[PDB]
């Protein structure tokens, strides 16, 4: 039913939906069989960050996840999104848990969304940045199990009150103002997307992952969307 | 009922509602008689700019209207925003017509706000920016008369067919998304916005203004608002 | 000797060192021969805008050319910065006349570099926008031909006393402070460009174009470089 | 023969040349002999942060300095500089160490600067973000005894070897472009700066400060500047 392209950072190994055998970091074009991925090392309990960058000059969706020790994994794709997307979408966060489980802890999150004419200077622009959460966030739509706590973070899936990370969860963040993210006389519509995040599991293997989604302004979590879907899709096709 | 401070491009004298005996721009703490104004030559047919600044440190709104030969007017007033507004907003532009009338047309309209902690870095931050209007403008709230065109424009205020502005008109349009513009932790809580206008009239005399408000989420323009309470007040008082 | 970065807009094909036979945009690196170029319609007498685009994870430098009728011209091209150009650089526009001619005119120009680390938010950013340039301009670096006039634009290549263009004039501007473009430990490294141009000409035909350009710190215009080597390259290699 | 506009952080009362007697932080209008003052609790070895403020609108110069746990100092000025600075400067960050001493170590610095004209949209701006100093810094002036190091830091004053602060020690870093701070025909003309520090002394007490500025382009360390004339002044009148 929804539209979603995503970036998703997936922490788990579903080899039989498509998944290399490997976490991995890809991007998702109307499908959670990625177009395209790489391998990824998470690094249990350390904070990381994403960059997510896209232009309709060069058409290409590129993203790239690192740790302070350096260490990055990088994923790009050739893709023209007028062709894609509604013209008007919301942008948001996603995270599930299902049967391995993990924190999907946001500490951080930003965006930027650009149209320029041609037609001579400037511009329609949407710019938000989030560097602390509040426990009522007014400017975002809450979905699912998602919460925003005391402690500045936001908390995309379950916590126990002893902070641990239940399984079957999911839960999505979506910036509240519908986005302007293509127009067909544009002469560039750009968008970047960034943010720190805080994946930590005492469990055999983590699982599901987080994604940065563009979606519908009506978009909401498909019916059973935990675990391998990441609370993006309806099925595995 | 609801909370307003605003910035007044007033056109039109209202002399026994306080106003002064010329046009004049002016600034609203909770009421339409401005706790500070300033003389202000409207230039019919003309594109006008008007900038709006604040910051919590020196505690000062300031406002700027100009027009391209130069000529510009100036109102600041001290005021600590913290102990007047909630700390969720919404921000928007509001003009009226009453017994005399005039365009209030909005060709673009620009607006930042930011928190920044102790703390170390940084910072929440929105910004939008409009140069363009559309027919269906999915992050503006339209309220009353208020009209996006396909000339890119927002309208304020009634104009028919013909490029005629109606007498009698009340229109506003607010930003989709609540603003967060304190915060009692932040350091620096500040916001600027910018708009530009054409106000024009054939009329004996142009009215009746247009204003920069923010107000809480839930503000809608009062009952009987129209002419000299620009959309912002149930009252005169 | 220098190391050239290029976006050319040609107006003027030179079909014996590689110029299609067409005006054309193109992306030169290290060589006025371009790696990649695009047919483009330069319209006599119009206003231009051009928009450049990089970013160090998706690897390609892209460029479109456009005109307010909505006629444009799109060049990318996929390439690795880190590995041509020195970390420190300066920033410019250049411009060339040879036996023909036409105005070289700058009306604004904008710049954007940020250097993102790993580590965890941020960053290092140069950014720029000249709207308006004046006489004494004391952030440009002005070579050969180049003016900043009192009419706020600058003028790359000779202009007469009225209003006409003359030939075998070389001009450039460069942004004063030197621009850290790269850095090994960046995990996001970009940047933008943007400039507004007014190409007139009485002339048979016009010649010979407008460049943006990134060069080592101490780039000065090479011996010989007027008409088809735009300001750029000592020779046609 | 410089002129000097300055916020100070001086943590040390020099009661004798006007200094209140507690440390405190000030405003500097071509005079050590601050215009304006407040108290100020310097935290020995924790990281502060300055923010500092101005529009030619509202015409007050502010400037809030403070530390993790919430305590900030704030110090505001009203003032038209436009009356007493030149059109183009630059700007920098000073310190000093005399007859006692103290690390004035500057871990990031930001600025902002922009004229807005009348003139309808946009703009002449200039930016620039510091978050990591590196051990040649191409776009900073280093006068003095200021050093930028392998360690991501600017270090202002002398320290030795084993991270002791010098005593007699004056150092000053200038952004390396002049920056166009005010033009008469600009209905805005703002800037803002931000820089976090670190100040730690073992000594009996901590001298001399640390101090944002403003100056002429070819400003440079005045005769004799050490101990309580901050690098600025080349004497305490
Ligand atoms: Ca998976
Ligand atoms: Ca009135
Ligand atoms: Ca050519
Ligand atoms: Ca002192
Ligand atoms: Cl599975
Ligand atoms: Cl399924
Ligand atoms: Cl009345
Ligand atoms: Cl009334
Ligand atoms: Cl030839
Ligand atoms: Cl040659
Ligand atoms: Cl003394
Ligand atoms: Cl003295
Ligand atoms: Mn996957
Ligand atoms: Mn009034
Ligand atoms: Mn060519
Ligand atoms: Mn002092």
């Known amino acids: 039913a929804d539209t979603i392209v995503a970036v998703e950072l997936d922490t788990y190994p579903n ?21 395209k991925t ?3 090392n998470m690094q249990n309990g350390k904070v990381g960050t994403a960059h997510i960058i896209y232009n309709s000059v ?15 994994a990088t ?20 995270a599930s848990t299902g049967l391995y489980k993990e924190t ?3 500490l ?16 329609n622009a949407l710019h938000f940045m989030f560097n602390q959460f509040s426990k009522d966030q007014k400017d975002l739509i809450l979905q699912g199990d998602a919460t925003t706590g005391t402690e500045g973070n936001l908390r ?11 399984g079957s969860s999911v839960g999505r ?24 995040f805080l994946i930590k599991s005492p469990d055999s293997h983590p699982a599901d992952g987080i994604a940065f989604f563009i979606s519908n302004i009506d978009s909401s979590i498909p019916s059973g969307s935990t675990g391998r879907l990441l609370g993006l899709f309806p099925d595995a096709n």
Chains 1, 2, 3, 4 share one sequence.
């Open 156 to 166: 995309l899936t379950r916590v126990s009150s002893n902070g641990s990370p239940q």
């Open 173 to 196: 963040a979506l910036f509240y103002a519908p986005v302007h993210i293509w127009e067909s006389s544009a002469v560039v519509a750009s968008f970047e997307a960034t943010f720190t």
């Open 108 to 123: 951080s999150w930003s965006f930027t969304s650009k149209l320029k004419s041609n037609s001579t200077h400037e511009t």
């Open 38 to 40: 790489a391998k990824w």
């Open 104 to 106: 999907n802890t946001i």
């Open 58 to 72: 060069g058409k290409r969706l590129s993203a790239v996840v690192s740790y302070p020790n350096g260490d990055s």
């Open 75 to 94: 994923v790009s794709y050739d893709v023209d999104l007028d062709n894609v997307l509604p013209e008007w979408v919301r942008v948001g966060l996603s």
């Open 15 to 35: 080899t039989d939906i498509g998944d290399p055998s490997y976490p991995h970091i890809g991007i998702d074009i109307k499908s959670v069989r990625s177009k």
